Input
Amino acid sequence: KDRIEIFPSRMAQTIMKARLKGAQTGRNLLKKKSDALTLRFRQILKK
Amino acid sequence: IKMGGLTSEQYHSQVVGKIGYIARCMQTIDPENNLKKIREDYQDVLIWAEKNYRFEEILEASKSGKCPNDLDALSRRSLILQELLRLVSSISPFKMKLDLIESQYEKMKQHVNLWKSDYHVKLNQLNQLTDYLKNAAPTPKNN
Amino acid sequence: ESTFGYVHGVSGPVVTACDMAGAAMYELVRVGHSELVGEIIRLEGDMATIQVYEETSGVSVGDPVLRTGKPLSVELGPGIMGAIFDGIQRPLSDISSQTQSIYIPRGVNVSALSRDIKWEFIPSKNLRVGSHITGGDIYGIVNENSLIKHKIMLPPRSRGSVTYIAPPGNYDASDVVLELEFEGVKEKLSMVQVWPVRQVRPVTEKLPANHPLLTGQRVLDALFPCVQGGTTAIPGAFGCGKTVISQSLSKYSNSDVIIYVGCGERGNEMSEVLRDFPELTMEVDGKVESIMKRTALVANTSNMPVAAREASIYTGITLSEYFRDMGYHVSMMADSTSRWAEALREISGRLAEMPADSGYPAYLGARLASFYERAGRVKCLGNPEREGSVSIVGAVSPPGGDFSDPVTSATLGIVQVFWGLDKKLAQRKHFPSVNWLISYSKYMRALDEYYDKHFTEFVPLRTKAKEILQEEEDLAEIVQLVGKASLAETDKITLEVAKLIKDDFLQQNGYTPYDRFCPFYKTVGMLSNMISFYDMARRAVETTAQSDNKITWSIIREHMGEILYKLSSMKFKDPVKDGEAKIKADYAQLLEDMQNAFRSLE
Amino acid sequence: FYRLKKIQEKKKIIKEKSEKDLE
Amino acid sequence: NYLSQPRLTYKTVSGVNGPLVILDHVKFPRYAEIVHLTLPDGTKRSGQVLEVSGSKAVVQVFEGTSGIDAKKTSCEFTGDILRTPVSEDMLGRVFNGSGKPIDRGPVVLAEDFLDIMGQPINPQCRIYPEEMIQTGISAIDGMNSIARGQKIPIFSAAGLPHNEIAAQICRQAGLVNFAIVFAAMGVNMETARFFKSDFEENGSMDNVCLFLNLANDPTIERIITPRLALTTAEFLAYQCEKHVLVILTDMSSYAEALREVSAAREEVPGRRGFPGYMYTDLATIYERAGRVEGRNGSITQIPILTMPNDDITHPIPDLTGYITEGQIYVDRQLHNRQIYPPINVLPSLSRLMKSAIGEGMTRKDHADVSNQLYACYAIGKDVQAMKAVVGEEALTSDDLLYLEFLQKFEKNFITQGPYENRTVYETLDIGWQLLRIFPKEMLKRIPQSTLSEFYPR
Amino acid sequence: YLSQPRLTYKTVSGVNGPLVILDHVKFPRYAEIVHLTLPDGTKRSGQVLEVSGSKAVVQVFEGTSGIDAKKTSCEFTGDILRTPVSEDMLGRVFNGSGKPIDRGPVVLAEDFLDIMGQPINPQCRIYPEEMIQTGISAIDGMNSIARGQKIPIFSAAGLPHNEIAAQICRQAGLVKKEENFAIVFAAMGVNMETARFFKSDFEENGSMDNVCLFLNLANDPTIERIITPRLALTTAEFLAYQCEKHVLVILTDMSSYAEALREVSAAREEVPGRRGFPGYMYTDLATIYERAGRVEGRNGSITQIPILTMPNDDITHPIPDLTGYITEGQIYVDRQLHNRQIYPPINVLPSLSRLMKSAIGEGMTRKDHADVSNQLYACYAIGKDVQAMKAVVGEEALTSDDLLYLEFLQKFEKNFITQGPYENRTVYETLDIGWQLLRIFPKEMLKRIPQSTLSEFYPR
Ligand SMILES: Nc1ncnc2c1ncn2[C@@H]1O[C@H](COP(=O)(O)OP(=O)(O)O)[C@@H](O)[C@H]1O
Output
């Protein structure tokens, strides 16, 4: 539920830091996708 | 040694126990000595109690393998005789023909696991009803 | 030789003693002028280290330390039932009587059983002078309670032939009731035997477990069943409900007697038991009777001296094994094995031993293993045949609420049943808070024969219940990324019957008159209706989605909203007011109402 | 840290006892 | 009988290490006896014997070891444990951490001396607490109700208004005479004055005793500060039948003294480095509560603790959680929105509410209302968490009603004036006028009889 | 020959958890054994863990409770722990110390052997080659066990590793185109239901006339578990290397063994490895696990399948971790598959078998075996990846190929892994099922299989 339950280790710290960078990157990519579509959508509304 | 977690002394003590109890049960159901097919299927144990031996003498004979000494077999053998003793005790004013006991003994002896059987359940129901009525006061329910 | 040594030193619950040459490890030893009670945990020369079962504050160097030879042991006999004992077997009712205090004084030596009470003794009649007798033989009944006939029996170490047996009459804990001879040596017995709590009381056999430990809780008895003779754990964070499960089993179960073991627990718990259990009643043979007659409490509240938590747990199981040898289906609430493990942490810390995980001693896993495995269904010792059982339920309390806890980690390797409680359910006041994804019972394969004999429809229902309750979580991980509009109609039906089974079957408000208990017939009737709705709703969609005339979950809800409300209402049926036939007839009418409604949709 | 601290204290005790045993 | 034998005094300091001073040549040391130390400059300190071994007594010094000396330090061994002079004369007075007076009044005349450790209340004599206290606060009296003689802490994040909440309880708490023990450990002076002033503002000061240990007072005195408070509470309750309430303030600043002593002794560490005995030490505080047979007294405890990094699972709240009769939670998510008192009902529970409510204590509906309020508040948080991802367009009309329930609930049921007293009956009526937001049949926690008597009004 | 009489001491200078500290001892040996006689006259065996001058630290097998620092008569044997052994140990049950627990007498020795064994010269290890059909497709196909391989079953607590191991004991035998294993079984710290389950299953299958069970139940003393696996392996080496038997050795829970080393190591104040186990855990586990495999000039061979309760479900815990370094792969049993009702719950991905490639090919198996396994394994892995994608990017983002890997994953667990408790599937039937699953994809997708093997076995 609240946590991923990878077992506490330097392995898990490595993997979770990489997951955080992956998730923040994925947020920003999908936010860029949203903004690009949002700009086109607002242009379409005016048109 | 060590069988079921019992020490050697305890294991043989349980055996001597089962021997003495089987003998008591037989003497209880058959003070007439007329359940002879049943009696014969316990003569190997009953003899050590029919003889006036001391407890430790039967123990040393069991340690020497002279007495019967498989505690599980003695337990099954004991149970068969006990459930007949429960039957007889549940109906004391009505004790049935002796061959009906030896017939029901055959039906118990044939069973793969008498302890799980409906026979034991029927005896439990009889004892519950009987033991209550040995103590319950006069009422419409109890009458 | 001296009967006493002298306190060489003290550190909290540990006392070192000099002039202890010839001590035995785990010998019971009195400490101090006030005669504190303790047990030798280590030997270090002509010198000993004693774990003390009372707080040592006030003990002085050079105080007398009196040996006893005996290991830590419990008196067993008539007058156990309904009593409350501390972790060192002192009966709290008699402490209260003799002292008039609000508190247990340090140094009390009160006898573990009330040796002044003349009990009614009924010798077996089968025994007589010269008869052969062995450990576990019932030489007589005592009519202790209207429920529990006490079945006095020869101590397991003893064997011999009957020198004397007392006639029917009234006797006490000092009156000689039986005398044996063995190897020319006589041995008198009173009605009270004494047993070392650390030594397992032996048995003829430990059998497989194959009769459900009936419990008031629907989710437990249906989806994760315990069995008479089986172990169980209830790991849960604080406030999760594990103590109310422990109460509920004790209040309402098919257990013939309950030993409850308040090891390190909050004091109001013991007061609540002693308030409720004399007033709650079962029935036997047409006589209503107070359930306290079938219980005993071992108490050691959280502020009582740490060491006594160990003696408490071993007392609770040793009493349980005594009643097991009588052929009773005993149950025993080990009401927190983590607060026990914390007492083993404490003694280990004072001994300066090397800790395993989170400070716990390395032998913790071994102590817990050799404790829960004292459960079983057993061919008793001795001659009149009995099938007693102990069932052990341990309320593990994981520090921080996390099952990575070493007590949990050991306990789960031992117990055959896991009822893992979820704090998120307890926050929502969903109770009993059993997480159905992580919980399990290993006994299902044995119990399936009982369900086949008495409830042949049940195994299909139990399977469909567990599956729907898993499919909910499989759907949730999707829904949280896209929204509920993604769901197929089969999935909406799945979530709805999961919500019924969650909020109206698994949920149970165990203090209310209607959720107080739940018979199996009520339980299966509720689950049967809910799963009958699932199969019929699923069938209706599968039957019609092949066409433009497709049935949907919304169509069903709008045509059958009263049926959903009736299904939710099923929990409110009350066994005190409604007979089994009446509840079953209402449930049959729900099945018919559902069938006729679905027949109108199809 | 705690296990190593206790090991180090046990060593210090053993050293002290070993020097006392020179008498 | 009195201890007649003349006291010894030792210069035989033979080591000093952290807060410990190790004596030698001591004649029959007693575990836990108290020792007074005179420093070379004539300063007086006090300390408890923590270990004894032959001639050695390991004394922990309360007032710190700085200035203890291996030649000139004089240890007067008192020959007994830490007794405290107690009396009903301690009401309307203020004490330092170790129970010395600081209100400029005289030393307490003992009506008796009691052992600071108390005694284990016999589980047979203990009476299960059930007579409800109204605190006046709806988030308590409605959904987390407190019984007379309950122990139930207030958990808070740091900087939350938990002081004001405790002050309000000490302004409004009463049954459907009363006296207060208050203790504070490691409190800042800017808050000590607030508590002292509040008991004056409420007019209550004559019926209350304040034990104050401030953050710059000695840390080891915090170990005994709540024990002194409880010993006075036992004297007032069990010896004098007073209906005592005990407030223990920042049990966290107490628990930090346990962690310090643990590290200084090298005790086996549990989670976050608290000693293994942390649960027992907390029990030795928290179990001195509840009624006892024949005595009309009833020690109620409301400990207060700042949870570190706001973490509910931290050892301080978590072990307190296992011991206390449920817990009351105060939350930033309410306080930032100015929702005073910021009590979040949902994570809260009261173990004794089960028997403190319903006919003869409170109105018949109360238990059912409480459960249904948890159900709707919880579902409201769940649909709020849904809206925060997928928007209101994904929510059904019923899901938006649960979201509206959470909003209307926090603005009315929890939101209350700092001096506003609400009866349980008024709290229940607010509960029902919120529950009426849903149709009668949606109230799935409530029986049909309760709905027929209480839903339509 | 022991022509000199045994000494005996009442010089127990300390007793400390499982340790008894003797003093005034004359010329002790490391790993010598002693017979402690308690005050009540009862006997407990022990073994010397340390010596220094007059002092000897005895580990006590039957636990230390009741030992007394003045009365305890401690008898030294003069020698290390040698077990008796004979072929008469087949058809019997023993406690972990090696005493009988059936009604029968003590073992009448054909020889005495040191329970540590002796190092087998690496030159003389004949390499394992014959594959054993276990009867379970997940460990006959995608993984396999060579006769002489060391391949343990890792399992989390509560999982059905008992049913796996017993299913292997029923089914397992050589590939068909006198010979069956003698099964040596050792239980350490087992719950009673586990003891009953194996003890019953060997008798109910009727194979009991050719097996030997050492039982240590959870309520038997901790220290006995140290002997128990070494004792069993010594019986295995006697039967195999001196009597030509093919032996299967099952160890039921190496975690309850590792906990026993932890308990005594902690009591000794030894420097710990991770999680407080003795730092020597690796070499210690090696002296157990390495005692396996065929030897020069013998036909006899020991296969070990040790079983190991993964603590807290953690594959990286030191007990499974150090085991994985020593054992020639592992079979991993997973909570996830168990919760899904997949019996046996073998997660094929972390499961590995170092010898398997040498046990397969023409004349050993159907010639496709290696190729089919590699393809199936990679497909299951891609399956788990696309299963995560079904949430992270959505079902609507899956390609037709990803949906085929998802269909493969489902059908594979339902048919490849799921056995039932008695279905003794041949290797040949397993590869037929393998192809029947590979047939889901277009031929060109099967990049791990050579085009010759595809042309022979894909169009089926
Ligand atoms: N089965 C239940 N039915 C109703 N309320 C419950 C139930 N289980 C938990 N609660 C409530 O939550 C409280 C906390 O659970 P409890 O078992 O008493 O504490 P803990 O988990 O710490 O042992 C209960 O006393 C009760 O008030």
